[PDB]
Amino acid sequence: AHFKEYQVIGRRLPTESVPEPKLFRMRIFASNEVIAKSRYWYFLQKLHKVKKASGEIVSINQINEAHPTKVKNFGVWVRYDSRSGTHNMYKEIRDVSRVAAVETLYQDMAARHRARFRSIHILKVAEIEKTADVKRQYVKQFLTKDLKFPLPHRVQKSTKTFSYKRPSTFY
Amino acid sequence: IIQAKRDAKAAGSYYVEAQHKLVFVVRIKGINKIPPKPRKVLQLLRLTRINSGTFVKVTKA
Amino acid sequence: LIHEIITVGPHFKQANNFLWPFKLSNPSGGWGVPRKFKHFIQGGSFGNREEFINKLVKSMN
Amino acid sequence: VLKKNPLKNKQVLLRLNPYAKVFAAEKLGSKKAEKTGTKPAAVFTETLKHD
Amino acid sequence: CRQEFLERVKANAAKRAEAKAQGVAVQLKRQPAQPRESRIVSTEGNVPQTLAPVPY
RNA sequence: GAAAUUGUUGAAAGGGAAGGGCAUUUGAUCAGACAGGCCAGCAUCAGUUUUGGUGGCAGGAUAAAUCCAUAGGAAUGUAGCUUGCCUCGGUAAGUAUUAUAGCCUGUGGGAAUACUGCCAGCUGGGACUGAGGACUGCGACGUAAGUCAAGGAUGCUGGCAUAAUGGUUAUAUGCCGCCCGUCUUGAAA
RNA sequence: AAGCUCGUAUCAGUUUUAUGAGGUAAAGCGAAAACUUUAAAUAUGUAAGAAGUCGGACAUUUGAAUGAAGAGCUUUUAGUGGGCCAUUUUUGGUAAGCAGAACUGGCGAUGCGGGAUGAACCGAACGUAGAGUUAAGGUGCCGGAAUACACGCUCAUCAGACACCACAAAAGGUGUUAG
RNA sequence: GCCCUGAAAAUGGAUGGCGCUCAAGCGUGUUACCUAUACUCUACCGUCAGGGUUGAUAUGAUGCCCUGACGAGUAGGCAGG
């Protein structure tokens, strides 16, 4: 829905002569807790031989962002299994927070690839501090000096069905 | 609980909460185009009619 | 009785079977969720949500 | 004959479970708990932010 | 098939016998798996390790 | 001396369907009852329920942030410096880490606010329902007497006291509606 | 439907535990995957107690959960004996369609909302009425409901509004966006 | 990923029609919302069930009162009118 980012660890159950295994951690994006948990178990069953019955959860913690309103360039390495074999992808965002960036990503993948939330994988978020190592261009053009641009053809959303005025946009 | 987890976070440790022992259950789907084993189940748990519900103790079985 | 429930106690099965299945309305607010019959994990309505039942039920009361 | 509800009809709320009255006085969900500065661990916040 | 039932019966009567001998509550009926309780874990043997699901 | 069916008068309708159902209008028509019937309205109460305001609390990283100080860093390089044009101040390229703007990061400080949850917290508006019929009892208020919003609604008032409401009926109108029964009935025709 | 023993009890299209008549080897370490070596899963059997336990001894926490205190013995009576579709498994196969079995669910006796209409779809426990809330489906108008908000992509010289993997189908294309 | 082609007939003809193109299309997310004999609350009917009931023969004992759940239905059966 509207998204959150969560921190999870699983501590796969103490068996005799191997108590306290190695506390496998993930950072997982979802709107709530239990969805987050289920995705941890889903990735974990993929990544090594676990089941939920053979595993147990340590904690859930919402990861707030350190300095939200810092505008950030993010770059995200992802995978998705579309109808073909699975395949990788990188994308780049100018945005405010990790969570909002992946929100926009999920919708854009939905547009351009008919890509579902269920069949997306995130590998990784990263943040780029220095400019000019961003690979893409459509963010890169939003980085120039003394920037100005217009809102052409602005339209006003009236409640009424009539207008008596012969409207205009401006310009 | 809240003091414990606070103190464990101070300690660099993690409180695992008790796995809960009670649930509430609600029937959603109504009566028909049901498979029979679940029908028998719900007759045990008295969740016959729609938007009917109850408490249940938690265990393996 | 409530304490017996929540601290699920000795005389719990007997209290529960004293109690009827609760007959609930449908939700006052809506469910949300245009479709019900997928898992809650998938944005559905069924399954195990484990705290949001309380929201759901005060709506359904 | 008739279900008179609790959760309005305070009188029948008091006909039952009469701990309500001292709930009225002390009010017992506006219960200000005693705050303790007890900081979390540095390792914990480090694994929170950093991986 | 039933050898489990017989050895269970003799275990049952054994705990019956000792519980009748030394006066204690009997609790002879079986008990299922049950919901597990709280237990602190501290990450001192290992710090929490984070994962990279590429998968390859 | 019925009905099919036919005429005549009177009422009404009608653009390639008839009749049927639900609700109503218009018209025609109609019975009852006022030593107290019909329609309604206001207030306070109860069950049910919808929709707003507002307060107090708890949690998380005891929010994160903003904000204060501090250290360091760097540019889509602010002041300042150098060169060119010159429209004589704006470019160009260098300089310059705060200066004649500021930013990023690290630590520390003390708050509030968010989102979530709780209130046996206050208050308002709206709608439907008002079964039940001496008393019994569970309860509250109060020292008590007595009282109440507590085992199903009573108080005040007005109009009409009749075709006004209501009913019946033709009819308009919105929506619905496959022609009956039988035999195979699995395009079930 | 009637009796008689009773609600003592009875069981249940159910889970849990233990167990085979068998391994799927998805584990090769168990001879250089050679190996029955058995992580299991594919489910029937069995049971979870006086109907039991070693002449004589031991009562309901007397032996798991969960639900139903309506079950059982004998006698007797009406109607009824075939069939389409789907799904799961699996044998035979065909260009393809498929054929055969086994289980299960729907329809049959059965209306209602939606699907524009409808044997097979989706939802749904039918006395009459009121009020409320919703399911599946939908909200430009017909048509009751937002010409709602918001990210993207699309501009077809007969698009699409499809139920979807599915048949033309592998590809062509100096259309277009992202990788 | 969309888009065109990726083959079609022959009465005139259909995304259901109108018509729709920063959508009234397509994938997606948020909310509010309409709506069935479904669910809930209430009244009423009826049946079944559990209880109470000779005190004034309280004049219907096949009565009277209290409480609760439930109602589809062909062949067919039982019962009351």
PDB file of C-alpha atoms in Angstrom, chain D residues 5-23:
ATOM      1  CA  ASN D   5     -25.942  -2.866  26.181  1.00  0.00           C
ATOM      2  CA  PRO D   6     -22.886  -1.900  27.982  1.00  0.00           C
ATOM      3  CA  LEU D   7     -20.597   0.607  26.344  1.00  0.00           C
ATOM      4  CA  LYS D   8     -23.425   2.945  26.554  1.00  0.00           C
ATOM      5  CA  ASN D   9     -25.991   2.658  29.347  1.00  0.00           C
ATOM      6  CA  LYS D  10     -23.489   3.200  32.135  1.00  0.00           C
ATOM      7  CA  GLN D  11     -26.074   2.102  34.671  1.00  0.00           C
ATOM      8  CA  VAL D  12     -26.008  -1.451  33.403  1.00  0.00           C
ATOM      9  CA  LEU D  13     -22.301  -1.178  32.945  1.00  0.00           C
ATOM     10  CA  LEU D  14     -22.304  -0.648  36.704  1.00  0.00           C
ATOM     11  CA  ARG D  15     -24.832  -3.399  37.245  1.00  0.00           C
ATOM     12  CA  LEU D  16     -21.931  -5.505  36.008  1.00  0.00           C
ATOM     13  CA  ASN D  17     -18.179  -5.195  36.627  1.00  0.00           C
ATOM     14  CA  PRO D  18     -18.335  -2.337  39.101  1.00  0.00           C
ATOM     15  CA  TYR D  19     -14.588  -1.586  39.011  1.00  0.00           C
ATOM     16  CA  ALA D  20     -15.783   1.046  36.512  1.00  0.00           C
ATOM     17  CA  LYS D  21     -16.318   3.561  39.270  1.00  0.00           C
ATOM     18  CA  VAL D  22     -12.738   3.783  40.427  1.00  0.00           C
ATOM     19  CA  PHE D  23     -11.915   3.717  36.758  1.00  0.00           C
TER      20      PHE D  23
END
